[model samples]
Target: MTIEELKTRLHTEQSVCKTETGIDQQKANDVIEGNIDVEDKKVCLYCECILKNFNILDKNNVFKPQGIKAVMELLIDENSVKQLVSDCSTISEENPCLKASKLVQCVSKYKTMKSVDFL
Candidate 1:
């Protein structure tokens, strides 16, 4: 998946969540945190907006081999990104943080493992 795909999924899931849960899209979006709602998983995966709010390029952005890196000088540095991966691993499976947590791991891996890791 790509950021765009994730955005599309978020929109789809947001619509469903809005109609089914009767929660407004913004409120439902507020709680998704990604992973729990697969579609919205990317939104909160970064905990902060990687792209524009309500904007992701695809679903599999985390694992995809090629694309713009979701670099955020504000949210992560190499040490912090590594720390986030380790911390997310501690969440219990039942927690909504699992997917968001995993996304962090994958993103961190891409950042650290790749040669062009940005600062």
Candidate 2:
């Protein structure tokens, strides 16, 4: 699908996640936009919801790179998607919420995939 469609999906999930987790709307936006560091654990949970909805992450806190191409193929060059996964896949954290946050952060830090906003 188109990148705008993908952004819409992300935006929809952001709404659902904020409602589900009670994260402040502005702070949630801030975190996703990389405008501010995440301070609240609920922000991590918010990220968890968004990632899970995209199938980029699972409830058990695993990175699912195979899911990325489906969501991001338009915004990211297909060939580089593989390296994007290689760079971000091995991230780990004991807390599931933080795990989600870290994984999103990892994906966004990969310059190629980071071409899109808010991951």
Candidate 3:
């Protein structure tokens, strides 16, 4: 509902996704901080799971940036959020699991902004 709420949800999602995907919390932190590249399937699943928690990964399996920008309609620079999402244009892996995984890798490699922050 608000920035504070978003933060709270993110913290919980981090833990929940970790528990669900068996992703190491330390590794999760590293990915978020852009400290390391995303490679492992578990890490990608963790990222995808985080996106789902935020409602960004819709039921259609589409990566919806609108779900993210809608969360911060007031304070954030809407333009950057748009770029952050757009910069990593949808990856084209046919396999859904591998698709989300490769998508995470692409997003993690994105510069100009921490795109995965939306997760």
Which candidate ranks first by lDDT, i.e. highest?
Answer: 2
TM-score order of candidates, top first: 2, 3, 1
> In model 1, what is the error at residue 34, expressed in angstroms?
10
Error of 2 at 82 (Å): 1.8
Worst 10 residues of 1 by lDDT: 110-119
lDDT of 3 by residue, 57-82 (tens): 67677877777567435335667667
State the TM-score for model 3: 0.72
Q: Which structure among the candidates has the greatest TM-score?
A: 2
Per-prediction CA RMSD (Å): 10.7, 3.1, 4.0
TM-score between model 1 and native: 0.30
Per-residue lDDT of candidate 2, residues 1-119 (tens digit): 66677767777887888899998877786666654344468778887887898888866667887777676677667777888788767776788787777766666654322245545
Q: How many residue pairs clash in each candidate at the backbone level?
A: 16, 0, 0
Report the Cα lDDT for candidate 2: 0.71
Q: What would the TM-scores of all predictions be?
A: 0.30, 0.81, 0.72
Cα deviation of 110, candidate 3, in Å: 7.7
When 2 and 3 are scored with TM-score, the better candidate is 2
- Model 1 stretches with alpha carbons more than 4 Å out: 32-85, 93-119
Question: 34-74, model 1: which lDDT tens digit per residue?
Answer: 32233344434332233223332234333221222243233
Cα deviation of 98 in candidate 2 (Å)? Answer: 0.8
